[PDB]
Design a protein around this ligand. Sequence first.
Ligand code: CLA
Ligand code: CLA
Ligand code: CLA
Ligand code: CLA
Ligand code: CLA
Ligand code: CLA
Ligand code: CLA
Ligand code: CLA
Ligand SMILES: CC1=C(/C=C/C(C)=C/C=C\C(C)=C\C=C\C=C(C)\C=C\C=C(C)\C=C\C2=C(C)CCCC2(C)C)C(C)(C)CCC1
Ligand code: SF4
Ligand code: SF4
Ligand code: SF4
Lengths: 39, 63, 80, 73, 741, 73, 144, 165
Amino acid sequence: MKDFTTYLSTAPVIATIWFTFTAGLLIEINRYFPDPLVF
Amino acid sequence: EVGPKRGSLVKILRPESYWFNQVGKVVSVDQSGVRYPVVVRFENQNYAGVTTNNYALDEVVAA
Amino acid sequence: AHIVKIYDTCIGCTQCVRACPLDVLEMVPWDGCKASQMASAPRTEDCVGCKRCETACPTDFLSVRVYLGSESTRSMGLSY
Amino acid sequence: GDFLVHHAIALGLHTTTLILVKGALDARGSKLMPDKKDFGYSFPCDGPGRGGTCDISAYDAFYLAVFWMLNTI
Amino acid sequence: KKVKIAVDRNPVETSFEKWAKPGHFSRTLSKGPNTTTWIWNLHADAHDFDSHTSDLEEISRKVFSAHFGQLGIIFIWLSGMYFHGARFSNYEAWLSDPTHIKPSAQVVWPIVGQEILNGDVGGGFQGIQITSGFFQLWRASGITSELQLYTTAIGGLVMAAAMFFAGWFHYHKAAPKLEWFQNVESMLNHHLGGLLGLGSLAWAGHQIHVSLPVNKLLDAGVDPKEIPLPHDLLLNRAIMADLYPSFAKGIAPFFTLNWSEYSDFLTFKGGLNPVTGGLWLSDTAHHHVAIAVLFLVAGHMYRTNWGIGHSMKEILEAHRGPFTGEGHVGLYEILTTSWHAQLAINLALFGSLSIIVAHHMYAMPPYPYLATDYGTQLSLFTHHTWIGGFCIVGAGAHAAIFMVRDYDPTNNYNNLLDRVIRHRDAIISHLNWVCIFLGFHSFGLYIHNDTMSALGRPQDMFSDTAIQLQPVFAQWIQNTHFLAPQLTAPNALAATSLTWGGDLVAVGGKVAMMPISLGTSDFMVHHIHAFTIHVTVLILLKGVLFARSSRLIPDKANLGFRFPCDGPGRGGTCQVSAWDHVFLGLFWMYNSLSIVIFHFSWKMQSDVWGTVTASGVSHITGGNFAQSANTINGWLRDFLWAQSSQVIQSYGSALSAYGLIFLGAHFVWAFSLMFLFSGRGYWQELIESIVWAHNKLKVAPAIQPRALSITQGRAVGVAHYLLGGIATTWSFFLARIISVG
Amino acid sequence: QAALYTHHQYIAGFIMCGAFAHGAIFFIRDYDPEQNKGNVLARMLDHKEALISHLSWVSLFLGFHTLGLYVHN
Amino acid sequence: WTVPTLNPDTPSPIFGGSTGGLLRKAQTEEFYVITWEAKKEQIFEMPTGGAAIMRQGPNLLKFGKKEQCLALTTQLRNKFKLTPCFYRVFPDGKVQYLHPADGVYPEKVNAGRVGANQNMRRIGQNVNPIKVKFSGRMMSPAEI
Amino acid sequence: DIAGLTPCSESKAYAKLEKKELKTLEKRLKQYEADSAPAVALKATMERTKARFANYAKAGLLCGNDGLPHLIADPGLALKYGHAGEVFIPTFGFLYVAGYIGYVGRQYLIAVKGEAKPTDKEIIIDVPLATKLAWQGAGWPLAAVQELQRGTLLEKEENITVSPR
Ligand code: CLA
Ligand code: CLA
Ligand code: CLA
Ligand code: CLA
Ligand code: CLA
Ligand code: CLA
Ligand code: CLA
Ligand code: CLA
Ligand SMILES: CC1=C(/C=C/C(C)=C/C=C\C(C)=C\C=C\C=C(C)\C=C\C=C(C)\C=C\C2=C(C)CCCC2(C)C)C(C)(C)CCC1
Ligand code: SF4
Ligand code: SF4
Ligand code: SF4
C-alpha cells in the first residue's frame, strides 16, 4: 500500500487529480452561477 | 596541507566555469605544483553531465 | 583548415584523442597534471570540425577547442 | 478591437525586442558558450556536445527575430 | 523442431514497488532526475524494449503483454462506442428514417453555453452529428434495438478485462519462452486458418442467419419492432424458409454438393442495392464464405509437428537466381530474431491495406445508407488514408532501426540485402532523377496552365478544350471492367462497382453512386500523387540504406539510429541520422496524403455526389473539377476559398465547434514553426536568464531546467505540424460536408 | 495610402532588426571592457539577465492575455 | 621502430564490389590505402557499405578519404583486436605514412612527441577580439 | 457616460440583440414537441439567456453602438461611476490567488531543498507537506511583506551564477 500511495504521489497522477479538482470546481461554479461576467 | 580542507564547501571563482559563484564540496587537493590541485564535486551537473572539476588555489574561496 | 587548440586545463584523460575520427590529436608528455600527459594537435590539416573532441572533454570549461577556419577538400570530408 | 490589436502590437514589439536584445547581450558569451566572442558574430554552432548548441550565435538571434518582425509588421 | 507450449512460471512478481521508482526499466534513468531532460527521456524510452535489455525473450514477453494491453484499450473504445449508440444516440429513430435523420451519438452537458453543439439531427433528438458510420454498420449487422448495443458494450468491457488479465497473466504468471515466439510456421498456420478463416466463417454464419433476414425485412418496409428477433430466426426453419426457400432443405445441399440450391442467399448480383445504396448482403455473405474456405486452405501450408507442410527457411533458400547471388539466405534468421524487421514489413503492408480499404470502401459501399451519407464517406476515406500513410512512414522508421541495431554483416555476405546496400548509391541516384522528372512534369503543367491562363492564352493550357492529356489506360481499364459481366464474368449479374460505367444509383433523392470519368485534370493530379509518393519513398529509402554508413560519415552505425548530428564539420552534418529521414518523410507523407484527400473531396463533390432532379443530376459544386483543377489558382479559389465558407460562417450554429477547431488547428501548425525553425542553443541561453530571475527570488527548482534536445525539438515540431494541418483539413471537411452534404 | 503605409512600416521593421544586429556585432567586434570600465555600457552587460528576464515576462503576459481574450471572444 | 613501406602487391579482402568506392579524386588528387594483418579469415563490414571477408595474413584496401581508413581501423582494433596502418597515395606514386604516425597509437603517450597547438593558459584568459582586429585576415583571439 | 457609451439598460441594440437570440432559440424550439427533452433544454437555454441579459443590465454595464457590454479598466472612472466590479476587484482577486499559488510553490521548494534528494521530492510530490503548505498559504501577502522587510525574500548577488560577460 505504501508503494501504491507513493505511485499516486508522482507528478502525473498528482497533476491529473489536481487539475480534475480545479476543473470540477470551476465547472460547478459556472453551473450554479451561469454566465458570470462582472463582480 | 596546502589548499582547503578535504570535505569542506567552497565557492568557485572561475568566470568561464558552469559552477561560478556556486558551492561545491572539496574532494582532494594535490600536493605537487600542479596548476589546478583542488578537486571540487557539485550536486548539480553541468550541460555535459559532469559533476566534478579541477580548480586552482586562488580560484576557490571558503564559502 | 580548422584551428584546434589545447589549453592548460587538460587533465590528460586521453578521451579527446580516442574520440577523434581522423587522427588529429595525440598525447605528449607533460608535467602540469597527475596523468603527466597533455593533448596535442599536430595534424590539424586533416581536421574536419566534427567537434567530437569537445564532446569528449570533461573539464569545465573545455580544454580542447575547434574554430572552423578555411575549407578545403580534407576539412570538408569530401571523398570526391 | 483597437485595444486588443494594440496589445497584439505591443506583444510583437516586446518579443522582437527580447530576441534582439538577448542576442546582443549574449553575443559575447553565456553559460552554455562562455567563449562565444572568440567565434565571431556568425558561426554555425558549437556542435551537439553539452546538450546541443543549435542557433547559439547572435546571428541566429537576429535570424529568429526577423520572423517576429515580419509577424509584428 | 518440435512445436509445443514453452512457458516459464512466475518470472516477475506482481508488486507496486517499481511503480514508485520511475525510469527503473533503463539503467541510465534509474539513477534519478538531475535535469528536466530526464523526464522527457523517461517517456522517450518507455516502449524501447530492445534498449532496456539485450535478452530477446524478455523483449518478446514485454511485446506480447503490451499487445494485450493495446487490445484491452481497443475493446474499451469499442464498448464505449456501443454504449454511446445505446444510451446517447438516435439509432432507433434513424432506423425508421435513415434518409432524413442525421446519425448522432454524442450529447454535451448544458454548461457555459456549449449546449448549442447539440444540433437538431432529427428524430426528436439533439446531439453532435457523428461521421464514424457506426449506424450503417449496426444496421448491416441486423441490430434494431438499444438493448443489443448495450449488451455488446457490456461484452466489450468483459473482453477488455479478459485482455488485461491475459497480459498480466502472461507477463507475471505464465510467460512464454523465446522458442515459443519463434514458431513462425505454426503462428502463420493459425493466423491464416484459425483467426482469418474462422472469423470469416463465423461472420458468414451471422450474415446468413441474422443480417440477411433482418435487412431483407428492413428493405421490404417492415418496421424494426415487427421484425423477428435473431434468435427467433435461428430457432425455427419456417421463417427462414419463407424468406429463403433453400432453407427448407436444411444443410443437406451443402453435404450433397448441391451448392447451387443456396443461390437465394449466396449470389453474384454485384452493383448496389437500389433500396439502400449499399452492396447486396447476399454477396457479402457469399464473399465471407469463399474467404473463409480460402483462408482455411491457406492455413495448412506450413510444417509444424508432422511431415506434411512447408518450411519457410527451405523455400527462401531454394529461390536463387544468377542475378542476385545467394538470394534469401539469412532472411529466415533475420525475421525470426528481429522484431523491428517484422514491424517494418507488417507496418508497410498494413498501411497499404488501410489505403486499399479506403478506396474499396468509397467505390463499393458495403453498408446500407452509407453512400448517400457523404459526410461518413468522406470522413472514412480520409481517416483510413491517413492511418495508412502514418503506418507506411513507421515501416520505413523500423526498417532503419533494424539496419542500425539488428543488422549483422556476418550473416549477409552476398545476400539480397548485402547487394542492395552495395549499390544503394545507384538506387538513390536513379530515384532522385525520377523524382525530379516527375516533379517537373507534374507541377510544371500546373505552373504552365496558371501562366497561360493569366496571360490571356487559354488555348495554350493543358486542359480538355486546349492541349489535352487523356488517361487512355485508365479509361480502357474502366471500359473493360464495365463490359466484364457480359464476356469475362458470365456469372456476375453486374459490375463490381458503378464507377466503371453504366447507370447511376440514387437513394432518397441523392446520388449514391455514379460513373467517374477521368480527364486531363485527373491525369495531372494522378501524376502529382505519383511524384509525391516517389519523394516520400526516396526519403525513407535513403534513410534506410544509408543508416549505417555513407560517403559523408563512414561510422554512422556507431552513432546510433536517433542522434542529432555529427557536428558542424565536413561543411555541416545536420540531420544525417535515419530518425531525421523519418522526420522529413512525415512531412512529405502529409503533403502527399493531403493532396490525395483534396482530390477525393473535389472529385466526389463535383462529379459524383449531388441531388437528383427531373431529367438531370445536379452536383454539389456543379461539375467544376474538369474546368478548374488544372491550375493552382483553381484549387485555391474554387476548392479552398469557395468550400471554406461553411467552416468560417459556422459560428452561432451546431457546427461552430468545427470553426473553433479550424482556428485552433491553424494555431498549433504555426506553433510548429517555432520548433522547426529554431535551435536549442538560443532557448538554453533564454532559460539561463529565466533561471537567474528564479535564483534571485529563491524559486529555482532542484531539477535543472534544460531546453529540449535537438531531436526532441524536431519531434515536437513535426508532431505539431501534422496535428495542426490534419486537424485543419478535418474541421474544413467535416463542416463543409455536413452543411452541404 | 495603403501601399505607402505598408511599404514604410516593413522598411522600418527591417531597419530596426538591422540596428540591433549591428549592436550585437559591436559587442563582439568592437566592445572593449577595459576602456568601458564601470560606465553605462558595461553596466548593461552587468545586469543583462534582469533585462532579458523582464522582457520575457512582459512578452509572456501580453501573449497569454491577448490570446486568452481573443479565444474567449 | 622504422616507418613501413607500402607494398602494392598485397592481397585485398574478398569483396564483390560496390558503388561507394573510389571516384575521380583518387585518379586526380589522392587516395588512401589501409593494410593490416589478420590471424584468420573473417567477415567484416566495409565502411563504404557491404560485407567483405578479410583473408589470413596481409590485407590491403583503398578508400577515398582518411575518415574511412580510420573508421575501418577502429572497427578492426575494437572487434578483431588487430593493428592496422594506412598511407596517403598520390597519383604520381608518392606514399605518405599516416597512422600510427610514430608507430604508437595516439591514445597512449609516447616519448619523442613534440606538442603542437598548445596554449599555456585557459579559455577565460583569452583576449578580446578588438585586440586582434585589423590583422592580416580573420583571426580569433585563441590563435595568438 | 464614459467614452460616449450608453448604459445597457437603455441601449436599443442591446434589447435588439436579446430579441434576436430569443427569436433564433424560439425558432429552433418550434420544430419540437411541448413535453420532450429538446423542448425542455431549449426552454432552459431561453431562460438562461433572459436571466443573463437582465443580470448584465442590472449590473450597470455600459454598452456601445453594437449593443455589447464594454469594460472600464481605469481605476478612477471605475470607482467614480460604479464600475469597480469589471476591472479592479477581479484584478485584486487574481492577484490574491496567483500570489497564493506562487507562495505555496516557493515554500514547498524551500522546504524540500534541505533534504537528501530534493529532485526526488520534485518528481514525487510529498502530499502531506504540500497540503500543509497549501493550507498555510492563506496569509501569503502578510508573510511575503514580512519576508521582504527582513531581507530574506531575495538572494545575494554573490550567490547567483552569471555568464562571463
Ligand atoms: C495491477 C496489476 C499489476 C501490477 C501491480 C504490475 C506491476 C509491475 N509490472 Mg505489470 N502488467 C499488468 C499488471 C500489473 N503490473 C498488466 C495488466 C499488463 C498487461 C498490459 C502488464 C504487463 C507488464 C509488462 C510488459 C511489464 C510490466 C512490468 C511491471 C513492473 C514495473 C512496471 C510498472 O508497473 O510501472 C508502471 C507503469 C505504468 C503505470 C504504465 C501503465 C500503462 C497502461 C498499461 C496503459 C495505459 C493506457 C492509457 C490509458 C492510454 C494513453 C492515453 C493517454 C492520454 C492517457 C511492476 C512490478 C514491466 C517490468 O517488469 O519491467 C521489467 C514490464 O515490462 N507489466
Ligand atoms: C486459431 C489460433 C489463434 C488465434 C485466433 C490467434 C489470434 C490472435 N493472436 Mg495469436 N498465436 C497463435 C494462435 C492464434 N492466435 C499461436 C499458435 C501462436 C504461437 C506460435 C501465436 C502467437 C501470437 C503472438 C506472439 C501474438 C499473437 C497475437 C494475436 C492477436 C492479433 C491481434 C489482432 O489483430 O487480431 C484481432 C483481435 C481479436 C480478434 C480480439 C479477439 C481475441 C479472442 C480472445 C480470440 C483469441 C483466440 C486465441 C487462440 C486465444 C485463446 C486461448 C485461450 C487459452 C484463451 C489475435 C487475437 C498478438 C497478440 O499478442 O495480441 C494480444 C501477438 O503478439 N499470437
Ligand atoms: C461458423 C458459422 C456457422 C454456424 C455457427 C452455423 C450454425 C447453424 N446453422 Mg448454418 N451455415 C453456415 C454457417 C454457420 N452455421 C454457412 C457458411 C452456410 C452456407 C452454406 C450455412 C447454411 C445453413 C443452412 C441452410 C442451415 C443452417 C442451419 C444452422 C443451425 C443448425 C445447424 C444444423 O442443421 O445442425 C448441425 C449440428 C451441429 C452443429 C452439432 C451441434 C453441436 C452441439 C452444440 C454440441 C453441444 C454438446 C454439449 C456437450 C451439450 C451439453 C450442454 C450442457 C449445458 C450440459 C445452426 C445454429 C440450419 C437452420 O438454421 O435452420 C433454419 C439450416 O437450415 N446453416
Ligand atoms: C505498430 C506501430 C508501432 C510500434 C509498436 C512502434 C514502436 C516503437 N517505436 Mg515507432 N513509429 C510508428 C509505429 C510504431 N512504433 C509510426 C506509425 C511512426 C511514424 C510516426 C513511427 C516512428 C518512430 C520513430 C521516429 C521512432 C520510433 C521509435 C519506437 C520505439 C520506442 C518507443 C517510443 O516510440 O517511445 C515512446 C512513445 C511516445 C513518447 C509516444 C509519443 C506521443 C505522441 C507524440 C503523441 C501523438 C499525438 C496524438 C495522436 C494526439 C493527442 C492529442 C494531444 C493534445 C494529447 C518502439 C519500439 C523510436 C525508437 O526506435 O527509438 C530509437 C523512434 O525514435 N517510431
Ligand atoms: C516542366 C513542365 C512543362 C512542360 C511539359 C511544358 C511544355 C510546354 N510549354 Mg511551358 N512552362 C513551364 C513548364 C512546362 N512547360 C513552367 C514551369 C513555366 C513558367 C516558367 C512555363 C512557361 C511557358 C511559356 C511562357 C510558354 C510555354 C510554352 C510550352 C510549350 C512549348 C515549349 C517549347 O516548345 O519548348 C521546347 C522544348 C524543348 C527544346 C525540349 C523538349 C523536351 C524533349 C522532348 C526531352 C528529351 C528527352 C528524351 C526522351 C531523351 C532521349 C534519350 C535518348 C533516347 C536519346 C510546351 C507544350 C509555350 C506555349 O505557350 O505553348 C504554346 C510558351 O510560350 N511554357
Ligand atoms: C545602412 C544599412 C546597413 C549597412 C551598411 C550594413 C552593413 C553590413 N552588414 Mg547589415 N543589416 C542591415 C543594414 C545594414 N548593414 C539591415 C537593415 C539588416 C536587417 C535585414 C541587417 C542585418 C545584418 C546581418 C545579420 C549581418 C549583417 C552584416 C553586415 C556587414 C557585411 C555583410 C554584407 O553586407 O555582405 C553582403 C550582403 C549580402 C550578399 C546580402 C544577401 C542578399 C540579401 C539576402 C537580399 C536578398 C533579396 C532577394 C534577392 C530579393 C529577390 C526578390 C525578387 C527576385 C522577386 C556589413 C558591414 C553581417 C556581418 O556583420 O558579418 C558578420 C551579418 O551577418 N547585416
Ligand atoms: C503561432 C505560432 C507561435 C506562437 C504561439 C509562439 C509563441 C511564443 N513565442 Mg514564438 N516563434 C514562432 C512562432 C510562434 N511563437 C516562429 C515561427 C518563430 C521563428 C522560429 C518564433 C521564434 C520565437 C523566439 C526566438 C522567441 C519566441 C518566443 C515566444 C513566447 C513569447 C511569450 C508569450 O507571448 O507568451 C504567451 C504564450 C503563448 C502564446 C503560448 C500559447 C499558450 C497555450 C495556447 C496555452 C496552453 C493550452 C492549454 C492550456 C493546454 C494545451 C496542452 C494540451 C497538450 C493538453 C511564446 C510562447 C520568445 C520567448 O520565449 O519568450 C520568453 C522567444 O524568445 N518565438
Ligand atoms: C496604469 C496607468 C494609468 C493611466 C494611463 C491612468 C489614466 C488616467 N487616470 Mg488613473 N490611476 C491609476 C493608473 C492609471 N491612470 C492607478 C494605478 C490608480 C490607483 C492609485 C489610479 C487612480 C485614478 C484616480 C482616482 C483618478 C484617475 C484618473 C485618470 C484619468 C485622468 C488623470 C490623469 O491622467 O492622471 C493620472 C492619474 C493619477 C495621477 C491618479 C490621480 C488622479 C489625478 C490627480 C487627476 C484627478 C483630478 C480630476 C479628477 C481630473 C478630472 C477633471 C474632471 C474631468 C473631473 C486618466 C485617463 C482621474 C479621473 O479621470 O477620474 C475619473 C481620477 O480621479 N486615476
Ligand atoms: C509624449 C510626447 C512627447 C514626448 C516624447 C518623448 C520624450 C518620447 C520618446 C522617445 C524615445 C526614448 C524613443 C526611443 C527609441 C528607441 C529605440 C527605437 C530603441 C533601440 C535600439 C537601441 C537603443 C540600440 C542599442 C545598441 C546596442 C544593442 C549595442 C550598443 C550599440 C547600440 C547603440 C547600437 C512630446 C511632448 C515631445 C510631444 C507630444 C508627445
Ligand atoms: S573536431 Fe573532430 S576531427 Fe577535429 S580534432 Fe576534434 S574530434 Fe578530431
Ligand atoms: S579530452 Fe580534454 S582533458 Fe582529456 S586529454 Fe583531451 S583535451 Fe585533455
Ligand atoms: S544539428 Fe545543431 S549542433 Fe548539430 S551541426 Fe546542426 S546546428 Fe550544429
